[PDB]
Amino acid sequence: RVRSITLGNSTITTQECANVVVGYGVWPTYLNQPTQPDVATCRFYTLESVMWQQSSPGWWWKFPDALSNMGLFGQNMQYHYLGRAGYTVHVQCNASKFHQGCLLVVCVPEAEMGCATLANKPDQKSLSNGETANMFESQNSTGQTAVQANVINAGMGVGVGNLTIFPHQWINLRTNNSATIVMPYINSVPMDNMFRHNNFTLMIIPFAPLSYSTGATTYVPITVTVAPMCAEYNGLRLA
Amino acid sequence: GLPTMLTPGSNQFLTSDDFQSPSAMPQFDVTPEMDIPGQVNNLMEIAEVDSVVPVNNTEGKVLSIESYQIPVQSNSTNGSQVFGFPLMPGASSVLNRTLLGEILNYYTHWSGSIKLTFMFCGSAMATGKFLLAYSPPGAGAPTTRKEAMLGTHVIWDVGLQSSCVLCIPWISQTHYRYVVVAGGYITCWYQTNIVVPADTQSDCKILCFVSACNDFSVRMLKDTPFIKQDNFYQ
Amino acid sequence: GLPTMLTPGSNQFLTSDDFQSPSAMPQFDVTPEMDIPGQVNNLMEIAEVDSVVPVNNTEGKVLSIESYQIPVQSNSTNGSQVFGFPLMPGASSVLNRTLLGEILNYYTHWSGSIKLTFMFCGSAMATGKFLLAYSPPGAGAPTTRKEAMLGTHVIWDVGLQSSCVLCIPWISQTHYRYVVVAGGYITCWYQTNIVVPADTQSDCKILCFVSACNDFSVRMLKDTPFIKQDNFYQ
Amino acid sequence: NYHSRSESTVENFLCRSACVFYTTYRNHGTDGDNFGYWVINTRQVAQLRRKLEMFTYARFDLELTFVITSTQEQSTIQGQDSPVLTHQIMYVPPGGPVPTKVNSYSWQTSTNPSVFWTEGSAPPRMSIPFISIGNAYSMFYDGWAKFDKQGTYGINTLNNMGTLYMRHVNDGSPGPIVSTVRIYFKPKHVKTWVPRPPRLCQYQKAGNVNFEPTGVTESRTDITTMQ
Amino acid sequence: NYHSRSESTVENFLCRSACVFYTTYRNHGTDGDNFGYWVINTRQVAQLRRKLEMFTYARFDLELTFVITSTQEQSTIQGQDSPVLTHQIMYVPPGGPVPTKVNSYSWQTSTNPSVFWTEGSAPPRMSIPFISIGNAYSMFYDGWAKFDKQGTYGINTLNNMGTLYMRHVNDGSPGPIVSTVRIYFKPKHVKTWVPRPPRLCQYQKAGNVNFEPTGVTESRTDITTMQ
């Protein structure tokens, strides 16, 4: 049936029979200066939808940078020196029964991406545009400081078909339309500066191209909604 | 004072030894371990994971994502072959660079069952049947729909299910076989054409996945034949 | 007679080893230990001790005892800054040569809380208030009295108490941080002017003390960057 | 029953002693550049780098074995009769003093670990613990050391494991002698997290993940072909 | 919980093996000055001297390791073919006979401890106990050995730890050979009393506490500045 989920002043709609992929089998928790929690940040931040077309390569978001300007939790990234949060990423897909296509929705921890120019580093804008998705290309990328965003190598110098090693979900339009991934906090330190470290990125790569019957809508909206979980920060006490 | 002998093999550096090494930084406290999610203790955990198989290995497609998409034609002769590759996870280029094949190429011997999943990426209203036929090693790939049906096969009905998991058994004369270059064959056949509400234009696709089963093992570690360096990178 | 191997690392002199050394003077009786007062077993006992912080580090004052005296002006703008230094016990020259900083410079990593004591050395009839404000690392030093008050602060009232102990918390992303070159800031602000029986001429002073708390530790011993020799002194 | 997965384990997979560096240093020289050095890195040998980068975070001890062999050179010096040669392998921990000359003050190694080895014995060995203020080495870092600088992408000071320095304690003879150190590297007590796909594209730089895009696999003639 | 203070302890702080002296002695010479010597002192190396003088009284055993390496010199002698070189490191306890020549009667060492070491083996090692008629070594002495003499200020005979003597037992070859001893010092079982401020002004003389007055710290521009 229909499941209604409310966090804070945000409500989303989910199917009862929705499969949830929980990271590496780990549910986000706190680290049980005393760290300060912020439950007000536990909201649904629905990003702008991306139009999935017949010739559309994948997208990616880097979420510390993606939610950097999303009201609360963005003010908290700007405010607190140290921060920690797990995320519930819910990727919806609005399509009819006459639409085709398969999607790989994968969250990649520490997706250090290469540059189009070998003797160069990608700049901040190319790696993450924030709430705006960065798109892959079907061919090699050219640029002095641009990310090598060819789809086959997923920007990481690996095989895109091997991306399933990370917490992923398959959206087959004839079978599924949604993907819920619950990513815990993954890092080599208990807590890190959020403004300069993307702990993971979300890649939505269409492995089977979108197709549709004549007269059906050409594009299929893909909606990403992110709910930070167990977010806690530095804490300012004693003088 | 206590007598001792030469014991041949002393004062030698055997590279594959397990002798204790003196600590250059004793009386130094390392930071305690942190509960990082994702503790992996064995490479088979990586090998147990489904990885998309590039079956569309035709020239000009290995540089695009179309190498992973098996094209299913809107109209074709019944009994035509949709695709076919040998069961050589560490040798055949179809399965070589998968997660399973990448793990296998780090070793010399392997044993176990290959798990193959075929997923139909067509429309929900599309219906049709496929022959997912398996040929045992030494038999040879079938040439017609009838030869595939007379052997080991499943009728994968697209309308009933959009996925088909096919577990390839372990058939060899030894406990382990060499990763390098028989193994068998997977061939798919058009049992029936794909049937749709007669208004569509583009064709459907099939995605393939490969995985290892719980009885999978690798014996002799070696250097992978994939990464190569002329000298030190710095 | 008993067989023995080479065990690589033998016949070597590792400087940081703990092997027993033959006694050049055995069968010699050392004098018994005497109960000397002041047995110290750990350098933190030295680091736990308050030491006067030279905050008046202006040019020309480091060679005089005035470097330890924070001048409190008889008349100044309210909301002016009395003083300010960063929380770098092993890096900032204000805290570098203190007992705590001297201990810290012998090590590479450290962790713990800094204890700061500010003592008013003015007259018993003098009264006034100060803002002892603490800025967490990365925040930046406040520029006005209001910014200091909106953060972590205490109102140190001179009339009520002539001393103020301020415990600086441990805020870092790692268990230990490097002694060498964020840490935070201490800034004092004139909440109110110093009020006296209106007949005095010279100004008051503030003395600062630094100390380590019970949770203080240092990890990697090294050479202090302070003493230097060209060769042997004899 | 089930076949044993013993040598497939991460410990057996990664704890393999491999040569990661070799350098030659002279016994006499014009300047003081008669010493060999190596910043301890895991990203200079492709095989080891690929094996370690199959995981995201690792935590291991460094076991190092040094295979030092000396060769007498050319001619024009007679009556060489050199005594036995002694070598010093000084390890500089992170943040420690770094020599610039063969006879620098850092070689007096007040706190830098140092092993003195005389030729003819078993090769010298030393073990470096897990040295990081962080809780694990990070083979991948999707972030900046300083967010202001673009060139700091992927660099964090938590992976610095120190530098090794090698030199001759004694010249032995007035004639030329060149020694090769041939460091052999072996992780111990390895714990790894967050497995990653194997590196497909060939490496370009040790301090980069940059890559020329490569095909996912090798091509074949037809989708139905068998050879 | 509380972080471990293990390596901050006085034992870990002070029991660190450091080189405190090195000398070269010949195999042939005009006079008998073919020997090296070192009066055991803790006030000649600034780092160790500062570390010990952070306390007032100390009581420790001296562990000494000698790193002896020999070098053949120049030319004009052919067919050197020297056999292996043997060294004698004689320790002279306080009040013991002190050699003045390479072949003095004191080298026959009736009661002076002596270690004979052949080159190519592990470096020689010997340990000196706490040798003082007093109950502790005093790094500082606010008094006179003789109150009549002004120049005896700060000198007491209770800190004399003996003298080390090094020489060649055999010449080996008729050609020149020079050996360096490189003594490495390491206190053991250290007990310290009455902690003291670290030495701020640079040392001038080993047998003095004299100092040029120095500023308490480094200066900055303003009392309110941050960089």
The residues, ordered by sequence, that sit 6+ positions from E76 with a Cβ below 8 Å of its Cβ are none
| CA–CA separation, B17 and B219 (whole Å) | 18
The domain total for chain A is 1
Residue A131, domain extent:
2-233
Residues in A closer than 8 angstroms to C130, CB to CB, are none
The residues, ordered by sequence, that sit 6+ positions from A32 with a Cβ below 8 Å of its Cβ are none
| CA–CA separation, B121 and B142 (whole Å) | 26
For C214, other C-beta atoms within 10 Å of its C-beta total 10
Largest CA distance in chain B: 97
Chains that touch D (3 or more CB pairs under 8 A): A, B, C, E
Q: Which residue of A has its CA nearest to C188?
A: A239
Interface residue B32 vs chain C (CB under 8 A): yes
Helix (H) or strand (E) holding A171: strand A168-172
Minimal C-alpha gap between D97 and chain C (Å)? 9
CA-CA distances (angstroms) from residue E86 to B158, C192, E98, E169?
90, 80, 21, 5
Contact residues, C window 76-135, toward E, CB-based 8 Å cutoff: 81-86, 93-94, 96-97, 99, 102, 106-107, 111-112
Q: Do B27 and E7 touch (CB under 8 A)?
A: yes
C116: tokens are 């700061």
Interface residue E5 vs chain B (CB under 8 A): no
Q: CB pairs below 8 Å between C and E: how many?
A: 210
Interface residue C16 vs chain E (CB under 8 A): yes
- Asked whether D138 and A188 are in contact (CB, 8 A), the reply is yes
Task: Report CA torsion sign: A16, A50, B126, B159.
Answer: negative
Q: Is residue A27 part of a domain?
A: yes
Residues in D closer than 8 angstroms to E52, CB to CB, are none
Q: Do A162 and B207 touch (CB under 8 A)?
A: no
Q: Which residue of B has its CA nearest to A32?
A: B35
Helix (H) or strand (E) holding A182: strand A178-183
Residue A93 is part of a domain; what is its CATH number? 2.60.120.20
**What DSSP line would sit under C51-105, residue for residue?**
EEE----BTTTTTSGGGGEEEE-SS--TT-EEEEEES-TTTSHHHHSSHHHHHHT
B85: tokens are 């590759």
- Asked whether B189 and B145 are in contact (CB, 8 A), the reply is yes
Closest CA to D128 of D183, D192, D48, D63: D63
Interface residue B59 vs chain D (CB under 8 A): yes
Phi then psi for residue D104, to 5 deg, are -70, 165
Residue C134, domain extent:
1-234
| CA–CA separation, C101 and C105 (whole Å) | 6
- Asked whether E18 and E185 are in contact (CB, 8 A), the reply is yes
Q: Is residue A110 part of a domain?
A: yes
Provide the terminal-to-terminal Cα distance of chain D, rounded to the nearest Å. 35
Experimental method: cryo-EM
CA-CA distances (angstroms) from residue B219 to A170, B16, B108, B177?
33, 16, 7, 10
Q: Do B7 and C7 touch (CB under 8 A)?
A: no
| CA–CA separation, C66 and C58 (whole Å) | 10
Task: Report CA torsion sign: E212, E217, E223, E226.
Answer: positive
Q: Which residue of E has its CA nearest to B27?
A: E7
Residues in A closer than 8 angstroms to D211, CB to CB, are 114, 118, 148, 153, 157
Minimal C-alpha gap between B107 and chain C (Å)? 29
HEC readout, D116-168: EEECCCCCCEEEECCCCCCCCEECCCCEECCCCCHHHECCCHHHCCCEEEEEE
Phi then psi for residue A164, to 5 deg, are -70, -10
Minimal C-alpha gap between B131 and chain D (Å)? 14
- Asked whether E164 and E89 are in contact (CB, 8 A), the reply is yes
- CB neighbour class for D93 (10 Å; exposed up to 12, middle 13-18, buried from 19): buried
**What DSSP line would sit under B131-187, residue for residue?**
EEEEE-TTT----SHHHHHHSEEEEEETTT-SEEEEEEP---SSSSEES-----EEE
Q: Is residue A238 part of a domain?
A: no
CA-CA distances (angstroms) from residue B53 to A168, B62, B119, E42, E62?
16, 12, 11, 72, 69
- Asked whether C110 and C90 are in contact (CB, 8 A), the reply is yes
- Asked whether D185 and D61 are in contact (CB, 8 A), the reply is no
Q: Do C234 and E205 touch (CB under 8 A)?
A: yes
The domain total for chain B is 1
C48: tokens are 């736990």
Minimal C-alpha gap between E167 and chain D (Å)? 17
Interface residue B39 vs chain D (CB under 8 A): yes
> Are chains E and A touching, using the cut-off of 8 Å on CB pairs and a minimum of 3 such pairs?
no
Phi then psi for residue C196, to 5 deg, are -135, 160
HEC readout, chain E: CCCCCCCCEHHHHHCCCEEEECCEEECCCCCCCCCEEEECCCCCCHHHHHHHHCEEEEEEEEEEEECCEEEECCCCCCCCCCCCCEEEEEEECCCCCCCCCCCCHHHHCCCCCEEEEECCCCCCEEEECCCCCCCCEECCCCCECCCCCHHHECCCHHHCCCEEEEEECCCCCCCCEEEECCEEEEEEEEEEEEECCCCCCCCCCCCCCCCCCCCCCCCECCCCCCC
Residue among D95, D114, D123 minimizing CB distance to C178: D95
Residues in C closer than 8 angstroms to D96, CB to CB, are 108, 222
DSSP classification of residue D71:
E
